[PDB]
Amino acid sequence: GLEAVRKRPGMYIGSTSGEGLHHLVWEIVDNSIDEALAGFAKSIQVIIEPDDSITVIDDGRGIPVGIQAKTGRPAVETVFTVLVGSSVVNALSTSLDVRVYKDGKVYYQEYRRGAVVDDLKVIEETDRHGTTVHFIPDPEIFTETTVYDFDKLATRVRELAFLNRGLHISIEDRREGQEDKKEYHYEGLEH
Numbered sequence: 001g002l003e004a005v006r007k008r009p010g011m012y013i014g015s016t017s018g019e020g021l022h023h024l025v026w027e028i029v030d031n032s033i034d035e036a037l038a039g040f041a042k043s044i045q046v047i048i049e050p051d052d053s054i055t056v057i058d059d060g061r062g063i064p065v066g067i068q069a070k071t072g073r074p075a076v077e078t079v080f081t082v083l084v085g086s087s088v089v090n091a092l093s094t095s096l097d098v099r100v101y102k103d104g105k106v107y108y109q110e111y112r113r114g115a116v117v118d119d120l121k122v123i124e125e126t127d128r129h130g131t132t133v134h135f136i137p138d139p140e141i142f143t144e145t146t147v148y149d150f151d152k153l154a155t156r157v158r159e160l161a162f163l164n165r166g167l168h169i170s171i172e173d174r175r176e177g178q179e180d181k182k183e184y185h186y187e188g189l190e191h
């Protein structure tokens with residue numbers, strides 16, 4: 001399964017250079033965009049964390065957490081563990097954690113180099129809804145660079161806001177000595 005992704009990442013993300021590093025972000029962001037298209041997500045935050053890890057936060061419905069008859073596993077686990085790019089991001093990260101905010105509960109699971117740490121667990125109560133995915137790209141895969149380009153991300157985030165008119169989407173850099181944030185929103189009929 002995902003071991004094939006770790007051994008031939010070039011076949012899944014096109015490059016293991018800086019281009020592939022940035023592709024990981026879009027693979028997660030695209031899923032949040034799909035949930036905006038479904039009509040439920042209204043805002044997406046992309047964050048470059050101080051350690052060059054990535055957090056993507058949306059306010060959609062939250063990935064389904066119920067057990068599937070075909071797998072006997074929660075749907076959210078399958079999203080990240082079965083090879084449509086979320087599992088690819090998981091495989092090529094040292095760690096990925098998902099929090100699903102749904103029906104008053106926060107459901108949490110984490111993976112390490114693609115492998116499950118523990119069963120999905122309720123860790124908190126919540127009044128919000130959505131999905132938060134955080135990942136640390138694997139330097140064993142991204143041997144050229146693990147350092148993100150804020151302008152590169154910002155440029156595409158702006159493009160995505162335009163193509164998805166009505167969406168709120170932001171990009172934030174939390175790295176030392178260069179903290180920045182840009183927020184984008186193109187108006188619909190209310191304009």
Ligand SMILES: CCc1[nH]c2nc(Sc3cnc4nccnc4c3)nc(N3CC[C@@H](N)C3)c2c1Cl
Nearest residue numbers: 031032035056060061062063064086131132133
């Ligand atoms: C933060 C990134 C994110 N946000 C996400 N938000 C949702 S919300 C959602 C999507 N589809 C549904 N279909 C049926 C019922 N509930 C749904 C909720 N789903 C997700 N899935 C599900 C399948 C795959 N596209 C990933 C994601 C993902 Cl990944």
